[PDB]
Design a protein around this ligand. Structure first.
Ligand code: CL
Ligand code: CL
Ligand code: CL
Ligand code: CL
Lengths: 158, 157
């Protein structure tokens, strides 16, 4: 299926982050707050894999990084309104990603698109820290940010 | 030094391995697992997608996250069963479902059963549209990987 870029891929902390968008999808179970395939404008996806700095956390470099909490903020140029979109983990035909069906609430135009990526919640993931089997890295405390200041929403490309 | 619980199993879309080795220190320390000092060992359930596998959108060999894994231990000659809830974590060699464990009934031969449940309803999704989506669906009842003659003789380290 056709994917369109949001902007240039970013390397932030131990993460390589890509952003793409494409036609709205039908998800099962549907994230309850996300617009249906009919009501959405598009599906946005954050593709997140460990980079070389991720090795210190125990991830294989290039592997998908699960259990993260990803939120996107969309803000049309010249507007003070900011849309907050919670992404959810899911599999598509091409593997796991974090994503959401969305609506660009202020219509066609240029938007600032920001992904804020939080490490796993305290009780959802652990690291081995003993010298023998452990890792020397640790999860980031402040969310990591990947952003594009001039994304053009020019309507469906499908 | 890692030791197998038994031979790897292929159950549905999962390639499941079980190994044990010395206790580890985890941060945060999960649920009610014993500390590195209190534990007998660390047991890991290594779960990766097999060819069947691709039907859910995974790539062969990929770690399968968001699963809920529990182990049941029963010493031969005993009616008692100990439940071990595994937690997701990274070690220096990558992601695993693991747990520090203290064998309540001590030394002996055990029946070891891993029950693997698909992600919770609100924890994961599949694209199901024709265009972007997948044909497979998660399993309802937990998948089982079992070894009947696991020998616990004490630390091998
Ligand atoms: Cl913003
Ligand atoms: Cl937290
Ligand atoms: Cl910032
Ligand atoms: Cl049992």
């Amino acid at each position: 299926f056709d994917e369109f870029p949001i902007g240039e891929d970013r390397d932030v902390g131990p993460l390589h982050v890509g952003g793409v968008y494409f036609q709205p999808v039908e998800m099962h179970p549907a994230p309850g707050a996300q617009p249906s395939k009919e009501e959405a404008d598009c599906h946005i996806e954050a593709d997140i894999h460990a980079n070389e700095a991720g090795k210190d956390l125990g991830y294989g470099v290039g592997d998908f990084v699960p259990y993260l909490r990803v939120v996107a903020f969309l803000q049309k140029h010249g507007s003070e309104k900011v849309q907050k979109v919670m992404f959810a983990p899911m599999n598509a035909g091409d593997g796991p990603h974090y994503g959401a069906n969305v609506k660009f609430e202020e219509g066609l135009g240029t938007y600032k698109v920001r992904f804020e990526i939080a490490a796993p919640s305290h009780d959802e993931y652990s690291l081995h820290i003993d010298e023998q089997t452990g890792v020397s890295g640790r999860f980031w405390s402040e969310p990591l940010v990947a952003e594009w200041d001039d994304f053009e929403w020019k309507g469906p490309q499908w």
